[PDB]
Specification:
Largest sheet: 9 strands, mixed
Bound molecules: NADP nicotinamide-adenine-dinucleotide phosphate, ligand XKI
Number of helices: 4
Radius of gyration: 15 Å
Oligomer: monomer
Pfam families: DHFR_1
Pathway: Cofactor biosynthesis; tetrahydrofolate biosynthesis; 5,6,7,8-tetrahydrofolate from 7,8-dihydrofolate: step 1/1
Organism: Mycobacterium ulcerans (strain Agy99)
EC number: 1.5.1.3
Number of domains: 1
Keywords: NADP, Nucleotide-binding, One-carbon metabolism, Oxidoreductase
Shape: globular
Length: 163
């Protein structure tokens, strides 16, 4: 099973300036709970965006997709395409594609589940922002209730599965 997991502003922003333009502890916790013990596949820019104590993501098999033959990514497995990332020598019951926008676009046709956090933060998109994938009619979903973070932002989780 191949799943995508991301958090986006309502406006569709997932990344800015090489990082994340909000802080949402409940989403970090959701992400860590869903992915612990499993494989996480990411693009090289997402690998470079990870803060020090999270590079590699502890307790997960980290797979980094790059065209740079020769890239060294201590704590991760480097592969040269998304198809390679999804063709492991050692299978995993759960593989999560964890970003960014470039890799989500390649992975969406291959995935059967998306776990989406929606963040009610007003972020007019800016020209270099990374943006969320768009789900078409081949996906159907369920939405949790709007919740308020301990840090103040409204947020909610959505779970989509391929029809
Ligand atoms: N909100 C969220 O859920 C979330 C999640 C993850 C990341 N982010 C944010 O999103 C941003 C990063 O996303 P991004 O879209 O800029 O980059 P990305 O998708 O993480 O990484 C892009 C890189 O992946 C590699 N790549 C792309 N297509 C490839 C292909 N067909 N074959 C091989 N390698 C390929 C290339 O690496 P090389 O250049 O090395 O060849 C490319 O530069 C950051 O701001 C990060 O903080 C947000
Ligand atoms: N729902 C969902 N889907 C994702 N794919 C996702 O990004 C995973 C890649 C970045 O990880 C970081 C980024 C900053 C700090 C810590 C971590 C990992 C935490 C861990 O697990 O050790 C996240 C996420 C997790 C933590 C913070 C921010 C985000 C954000 F990107 F959404 F904003 N949340």
């Amino acid at each position: 099973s191949v799943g995508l997991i991301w958090a986006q502003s309502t406006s569709g922003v997932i990344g800015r300036d090489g990082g994340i333009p909000w802080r949402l502890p409940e989403d970090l916790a959701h992400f860590k709970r869903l992915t612990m013990g499993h494989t996480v596949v990411m693009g090289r820019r997402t690998w470079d965006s990870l803060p020090a104590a999270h590079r590699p993501l502890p307790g997960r098999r980290n797979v980094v997709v790059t065209r740079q033959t020769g890239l060294v990514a201590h704590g991760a497995q480097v592969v040269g395409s998304l198809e390679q990332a999804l063709s492991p020598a050692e299978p995993d019951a759960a593989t999560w594609v964890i970003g960014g926008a470039q890799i989500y676009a390649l992975a969406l046709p291959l995935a059967n589940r998306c776990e989406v956090t929606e963040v009610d933060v007003d972020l007019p998109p800016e020209d270099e922002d990374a943006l969320a994938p768009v789900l078409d009619q081949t996906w159907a979903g369920t939405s949790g209730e709007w919740l308020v973070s301990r840090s103040g932002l409204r947020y909610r989780m959505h779970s989509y599965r391929r029809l």
